[PDB]
Design a protein around this ligand. Structure first.
Ligand code: 4L2
Length: 113
């Protein structure tokens, strides 16, 4: 397991600790979410992000963050604002973007010299 993959698995673990109920752990199916696959044409979830890390498909933290943003944005698109899904997506988006902020990654870069 390479250096980049370790870093990504670390970010991924900290994000998933924000979702104790595993709402975002796996893909949303039309059977639990009517109309989901028509409303959300670019689905994403933490399981898929795990798989992509395992398959070494991420070239950068930017790419991992884009997937995480996608996941959150989907939940805020599909679900009404009074729902647990919308609220948790909104909270975790902002928290995960602080965690993986440009300035924090610069700090990390510094330390990796
Ligand atoms: C209805 C619905 C909307 C939504 O945005 N999300 C993220 C959902 C997620 C679930 N899932 C999918 C598998 C992980 C466990 C879970 O609660 C189940 C239902 C939903």
């Amino acid at each position: 397991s390479t250096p980049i993959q370790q870093l990504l698995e670390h970010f991924l673990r900290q994000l998933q600790r924000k979702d104790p109920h595993g709402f975002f752990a796996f893909p949303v199916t039309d059977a639990i979410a009517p109309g989901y696959s028509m409303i959300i044409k670019h689905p994403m979830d933490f399981g898929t992000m795990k798989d992509k890390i395992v398959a070494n498909e991420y070239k950068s933290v930017t790419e991992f963050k884009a997937d995480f943003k996608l996941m959150c944005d989907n939940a805020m698109t599909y679900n009404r604002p009074d729902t647990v899904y919308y609220k948790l997506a909104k909270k975790i988006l902002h928290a995960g973007f602080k965690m993986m902020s440009k300035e924090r990654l610069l700090a990390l870069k510094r330390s990796m010299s």
